[PDB]
Subunit: 155 residues, 3 copies
């Protein structure tokens, strides 16, 4: 038997003006599409499909979903945000998880290094599509060690 | 058969003066109590109870426990710390996991965005109570996308 | 049946000069060796061995691997990087996961608090050895609440 829990803050639609939530179903950030999915020892797929930057569910159930995104830049603040999204039978793409950083404000800032990891438990249906979207994609580093995206089914 | 490991730094009682450990069983931070636990597609409980801001264990075993807490503020540094605590048959609440950030020190800092994720594996007993506690709770953002708390049993 | 996926950025060998990748099989950072592995309620091993700072695999399969490393210091920027490495039947130690932060650049910075968590899914073989390595080890805090390393097999 599966024994698990995922509970969230009660604010369903946040009124925050800093990183505005979208009200017309528009995706925030730019979807990451340059993922590698079949290098033995580094990446794999087992009964999960990959296409168009999305992991597509074959088996309904509870999944732990996670992503790390590595922001690296050389030189005002940058808003560095990672979104994990779900498409399902619903008119809008759904933000499952959001994680945000601001770069250092000091005028002495020569460069930045901001790895953002997050993950959590979500009930998914067959043919749901999940993907990662980030602000400031031009600052993302697609180093296979530093940026990745995965999920596993919990039995 | 369950195959797993969780090993920790050897310092049992840290002598650090920056974020002092408590010596009289007093909880650090303020417990988060405004969690939502039953919105299909966003939150759920399966053989785990929720009450008084705590996840309460029904089935003894090994759990992966995690929480994300989103600090957002508009304007000295702020100590932003997330504690995951356990109550069991022990005279004190027990810190299982601690994760800390300091806000940017620059006088030019207009705002802050600090999402803190952590998680790990802990052996739990029936009726153990686990909760999340944070410093600077007034800066926490209970956006359901950004702040959450969960666990799952490992078979 | 195990249902899971882990996909990575396509850049196999990153050309970044900021945190240079190693080209002669040399390990980056210093391996953490002062882990505690058998304090009931805080740490444990179940069909995983510990020796020489490494978790050593007894059972081939898919593992979710994670580590948190807590950097704390009192006082230019510091590069704070966590590497999770694998030794297997391969001439070089293999970086599985890298996560990086830079400390605040402000000259007003009195102290720093930088907890770094990361984790992910990797297929491991029997007798593979996995460990954590960090830059600026003298700034690591081996508080058992704040710094840890674990993994579990996914069935
Ligand atoms: Cl920006
Ligand atoms: Cl880049
Ligand atoms: Cl403070
Ligand atoms: Cl707030
Ligand atoms: Cl450095
Ligand atoms: Cl900063
Ligand atoms: Cl230290
Ligand atoms: Zn700063």
């Amino acid at each position: 038997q599966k024994v698990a829990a995922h509970i969230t803050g009660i604010t369903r639609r946040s009124n925050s003006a800093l990183i505005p939530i979208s009200k017309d179903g528009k995706t925030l950030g730019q979807k990451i599409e340059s993922w590698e999915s079949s290098r033995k020892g580094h990446s794999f797929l087992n009964h999960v499909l990959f296409r168009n930057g999305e992991l597509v569910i074959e088996q309904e159930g509870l999944y732990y979903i996670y992503s790390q995104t590595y922001f690296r830049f050389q030189e005002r603040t940058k808003q560095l945000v990672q979104y994990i999204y779900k498409y399902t039978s619903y008119p809008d793409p759904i933000v499952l998880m959001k994680s945000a950083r601001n770069s250092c404000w000091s005028r002495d800032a020569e460069y930045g290094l901001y790895s953002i990891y997050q993950g959590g438990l979500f009930e998914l249906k067959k043919n749901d599509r999940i993907f990662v979207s980030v602000t400031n994609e031009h600052l993302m580093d697609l180093d296979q060690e530093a940026s990745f995206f995965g999920a596993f089914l919990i039995n």
